[PDB]
Amino acid sequence: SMSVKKPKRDDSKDLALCSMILTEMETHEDAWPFLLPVNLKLVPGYKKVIKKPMDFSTIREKLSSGQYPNLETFALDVRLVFDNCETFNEDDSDIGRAGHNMRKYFEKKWTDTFK
């Protein structure tokens, strides 16, 4: 509350560490469905159904340009990529499986880096 603060958690490396995680997600072999924005002209249904499209390239640009206020807003956009993927893709599809694998991969790096 006013003039009463918990001890300061060191956040000065969060930017570099989120960039490293994002690099690792970018270079994973199952990243291919997620590297670029879904082409809303060419993929029927996507525009209407997925209210907030997100992809690794968009996260990378947001990261590079100071559009994440803190590490949690970064994790929200990563998770949004996977939540969108589950909304639109059957679990038993290559892209559906890619999404589950990438989410697992991300969540472990997140825990090992920050928890």
PDB file of all heavy atoms in Angstrom, residues 34 85-86 89-101:
ATOM      1  N   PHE A  34       3.258 -21.074 -36.616  1.00  0.00           N
ATOM      2  CA  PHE A  34       3.182 -19.938 -35.663  1.00  0.00           C
ATOM      3  C   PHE A  34       4.114 -18.798 -36.013  1.00  0.00           C
ATOM      4  O   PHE A  34       4.099 -17.798 -35.336  1.00  0.00           O
ATOM      5  CB  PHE A  34       3.370 -20.403 -34.177  1.00  0.00           C
ATOM      6  CG  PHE A  34       2.578 -21.654 -33.852  1.00  0.00           C
ATOM      7  CD1 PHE A  34       3.214 -22.868 -33.542  1.00  0.00           C
ATOM      8  CD2 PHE A  34       1.197 -21.620 -33.918  1.00  0.00           C
ATOM      9  CE1 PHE A  34       2.456 -24.018 -33.345  1.00  0.00           C
ATOM     10  CE2 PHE A  34       0.460 -22.743 -33.738  1.00  0.00           C
ATOM     11  CZ  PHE A  34       1.106 -23.941 -33.414  1.00  0.00           C
ATOM     12  N   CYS A  85      -4.606 -21.583 -31.508  1.00  0.00           N
ATOM     13  CA  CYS A  85      -4.365 -22.805 -32.268  1.00  0.00           C
ATOM     14  C   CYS A  85      -5.362 -23.923 -31.840  1.00  0.00           C
ATOM     15  O   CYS A  85      -5.913 -24.619 -32.699  1.00  0.00           O
ATOM     16  CB  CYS A  85      -2.942 -23.296 -32.018  1.00  0.00           C
ATOM     17  SG  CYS A  85      -2.481 -24.836 -32.894  1.00  0.00           S
ATOM     18  N   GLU A  86      -5.600 -24.056 -30.533  1.00  0.00           N
ATOM     19  CA  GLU A  86      -6.556 -25.068 -30.038  1.00  0.00           C
ATOM     20  C   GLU A  86      -8.001 -24.743 -30.418  1.00  0.00           C
ATOM     21  O   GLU A  86      -8.819 -25.651 -30.641  1.00  0.00           O
ATOM     22  CB  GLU A  86      -6.520 -25.218 -28.517  1.00  0.00           C
ATOM     23  CG  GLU A  86      -5.363 -25.942 -27.963  1.00  0.00           C
ATOM     24  CD  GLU A  86      -5.597 -26.356 -26.520  1.00  0.00           C
ATOM     25  OE1 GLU A  86      -6.694 -26.901 -26.207  1.00  0.00           O
ATOM     26  OE2 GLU A  86      -4.657 -26.166 -25.732  1.00  0.00           O
ATOM     27  N   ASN A  89      -8.031 -25.722 -34.478  1.00  0.00           N
ATOM     28  CA  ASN A  89      -7.404 -26.918 -35.037  1.00  0.00           C
ATOM     29  C   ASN A  89      -7.759 -28.130 -34.163  1.00  0.00           C
ATOM     30  O   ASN A  89      -7.840 -28.020 -32.924  1.00  0.00           O
ATOM     31  CB  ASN A  89      -5.927 -26.814 -35.080  1.00  0.00           C
ATOM     32  CG  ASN A  89      -5.465 -25.772 -36.046  1.00  0.00           C
ATOM     33  OD1 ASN A  89      -5.184 -26.059 -37.196  1.00  0.00           O
ATOM     34  ND2 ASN A  89      -5.259 -24.550 -35.527  1.00  0.00           N
ATOM     35  N   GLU A  90      -8.070 -29.230 -34.820  1.00  0.00           N
ATOM     36  CA  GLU A  90      -8.310 -30.477 -34.103  1.00  0.00           C
ATOM     37  C   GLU A  90      -6.967 -30.893 -33.403  1.00  0.00           C
ATOM     38  O   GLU A  90      -5.856 -30.777 -34.022  1.00  0.00           O
ATOM     39  CB  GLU A  90      -8.855 -31.576 -35.052  1.00  0.00           C
ATOM     40  CG  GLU A  90     -10.369 -31.496 -35.355  1.00  0.00           C
ATOM     41  CD  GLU A  90     -11.267 -31.798 -34.158  1.00  0.00           C
ATOM     42  OE1 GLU A  90     -10.836 -32.492 -33.221  1.00  0.00           O
ATOM     43  OE2 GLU A  90     -12.408 -31.346 -34.153  1.00  0.00           O
ATOM     44  N   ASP A  91      -7.089 -31.416 -32.186  1.00  0.00           N
ATOM     45  CA  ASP A  91      -5.932 -32.073 -31.457  1.00  0.00           C
ATOM     46  C   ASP A  91      -5.161 -33.098 -32.325  1.00  0.00           C
ATOM     47  O   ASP A  91      -3.931 -33.139 -32.345  1.00  0.00           O
ATOM     48  CB  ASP A  91      -6.368 -32.693 -30.100  1.00  0.00           C
ATOM     49  CG  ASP A  91      -6.868 -31.679 -29.110  1.00  0.00           C
ATOM     50  OD1 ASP A  91      -6.628 -30.449 -29.244  1.00  0.00           O
ATOM     51  OD2 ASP A  91      -7.558 -32.086 -28.169  1.00  0.00           O
ATOM     52  N   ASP A  92      -5.887 -33.863 -33.131  1.00  0.00           N
ATOM     53  CA  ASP A  92      -5.318 -34.881 -34.011  1.00  0.00           C
ATOM     54  C   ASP A  92      -5.160 -34.338 -35.462  1.00  0.00           C
ATOM     55  O   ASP A  92      -5.889 -34.741 -36.417  1.00  0.00           O
ATOM     56  CB  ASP A  92      -6.276 -36.110 -33.962  1.00  0.00           C
ATOM     57  CG  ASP A  92      -5.724 -37.347 -34.658  1.00  0.00           C
ATOM     58  OD1 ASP A  92      -4.522 -37.425 -35.094  1.00  0.00           O
ATOM     59  OD2 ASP A  92      -6.554 -38.284 -34.789  1.00  0.00           O
ATOM     60  N   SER A  93      -4.261 -33.377 -35.592  1.00  0.00           N
ATOM     61  CA  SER A  93      -3.874 -32.722 -36.860  1.00  0.00           C
ATOM     62  C   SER A  93      -2.435 -32.375 -36.628  1.00  0.00           C
ATOM     63  O   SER A  93      -1.976 -32.349 -35.475  1.00  0.00           O
ATOM     64  CB  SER A  93      -4.743 -31.501 -37.169  1.00  0.00           C
ATOM     65  OG  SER A  93      -4.622 -30.413 -36.226  1.00  0.00           O
ATOM     66  N   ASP A  94      -1.667 -32.166 -37.678  1.00  0.00           N
ATOM     67  CA  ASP A  94      -0.318 -31.757 -37.480  1.00  0.00           C
ATOM     68  C   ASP A  94      -0.227 -30.422 -36.725  1.00  0.00           C
ATOM     69  O   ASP A  94       0.615 -30.273 -35.881  1.00  0.00           O
ATOM     70  CB  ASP A  94       0.448 -31.712 -38.759  1.00  0.00           C
ATOM     71  CG  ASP A  94       0.533 -33.128 -39.436  1.00  0.00           C
ATOM     72  OD1 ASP A  94      -0.325 -33.369 -40.298  1.00  0.00           O
ATOM     73  OD2 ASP A  94       1.475 -33.883 -39.164  1.00  0.00           O
ATOM     74  N   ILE A  95      -1.072 -29.467 -37.076  1.00  0.00           N
ATOM     75  CA  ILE A  95      -0.958 -28.125 -36.487  1.00  0.00           C
ATOM     76  C   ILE A  95      -1.417 -28.218 -35.034  1.00  0.00           C
ATOM     77  O   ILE A  95      -0.789 -27.599 -34.140  1.00  0.00           O
ATOM     78  CB  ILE A  95      -1.777 -27.092 -37.283  1.00  0.00           C
ATOM     79  CG1 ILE A  95      -1.096 -26.878 -38.667  1.00  0.00           C
ATOM     80  CG2 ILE A  95      -2.000 -25.794 -36.477  1.00  0.00           C
ATOM     81  CD1 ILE A  95      -1.924 -25.984 -39.565  1.00  0.00           C
ATOM     82  N   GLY A  96      -2.458 -29.031 -34.771  1.00  0.00           N
ATOM     83  CA  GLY A  96      -3.019 -29.205 -33.397  1.00  0.00           C
ATOM     84  C   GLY A  96      -1.946 -29.791 -32.449  1.00  0.00           C
ATOM     85  O   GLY A  96      -1.804 -29.348 -31.280  1.00  0.00           O
ATOM     86  N   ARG A  97      -1.225 -30.784 -32.939  1.00  0.00           N
ATOM     87  CA  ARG A  97      -0.116 -31.417 -32.233  1.00  0.00           C
ATOM     88  C   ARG A  97       1.071 -30.452 -32.044  1.00  0.00           C
ATOM     89  O   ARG A  97       1.650 -30.402 -30.958  1.00  0.00           O
ATOM     90  CB  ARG A  97       0.412 -32.668 -32.943  1.00  0.00           C
ATOM     91  CG  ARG A  97      -0.413 -33.917 -32.705  1.00  0.00           C
ATOM     92  CD  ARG A  97       0.288 -35.192 -33.259  1.00  0.00           C
ATOM     93  NE  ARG A  97       0.177 -35.324 -34.715  1.00  0.00           N
ATOM     94  CZ  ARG A  97      -0.925 -35.671 -35.377  1.00  0.00           C
ATOM     95  NH1 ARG A  97      -2.027 -35.974 -34.726  1.00  0.00           N
ATOM     96  NH2 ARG A  97      -0.903 -35.723 -36.714  1.00  0.00           N
ATOM     97  N   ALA A  98       1.404 -29.705 -33.099  1.00  0.00           N
ATOM     98  CA  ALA A  98       2.417 -28.653 -33.018  1.00  0.00           C
ATOM     99  C   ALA A  98       2.135 -27.711 -31.882  1.00  0.00           C
ATOM    100  O   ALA A  98       3.070 -27.367 -31.147  1.00  0.00           O
ATOM    101  CB  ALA A  98       2.604 -27.893 -34.304  1.00  0.00           C
ATOM    102  N   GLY A  99       0.888 -27.279 -31.758  1.00  0.00           N
ATOM    103  CA  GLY A  99       0.513 -26.357 -30.713  1.00  0.00           C
ATOM    104  C   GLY A  99       0.634 -26.856 -29.321  1.00  0.00           C
ATOM    105  O   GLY A  99       1.212 -26.195 -28.443  1.00  0.00           O
ATOM    106  N   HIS A 100       0.209 -28.108 -29.106  1.00  0.00           N
ATOM    107  CA  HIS A 100       0.420 -28.732 -27.799  1.00  0.00           C
ATOM    108  C   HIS A 100       1.879 -28.868 -27.477  1.00  0.00           C
ATOM    109  O   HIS A 100       2.265 -28.562 -26.380  1.00  0.00           O
ATOM    110  CB  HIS A 100      -0.304 -30.082 -27.741  1.00  0.00           C
ATOM    111  CG  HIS A 100      -1.771 -29.937 -27.674  1.00  0.00           C
ATOM    112  ND1 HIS A 100      -2.405 -29.411 -26.573  1.00  0.00           N
ATOM    113  CD2 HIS A 100      -2.759 -30.290 -28.518  1.00  0.00           C
ATOM    114  CE1 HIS A 100      -3.709 -29.367 -26.774  1.00  0.00           C
ATOM    115  NE2 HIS A 100      -3.947 -29.884 -27.963  1.00  0.00           N
ATOM    116  N   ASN A 101       2.731 -29.253 -28.454  1.00  0.00           N
ATOM    117  CA  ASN A 101       4.141 -29.459 -28.206  1.00  0.00           C
ATOM    118  C   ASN A 101       4.846 -28.129 -27.842  1.00  0.00           C
ATOM    119  O   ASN A 101       5.692 -28.025 -26.934  1.00  0.00           O
ATOM    120  CB  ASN A 101       4.842 -30.035 -29.445  1.00  0.00           C
ATOM    121  CG  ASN A 101       4.553 -31.544 -29.696  1.00  0.00           C
ATOM    122  OD1 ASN A 101       3.939 -32.195 -28.921  1.00  0.00           O
ATOM    123  ND2 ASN A 101       4.978 -32.037 -30.853  1.00  0.00           N
TER     124      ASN A 101
END
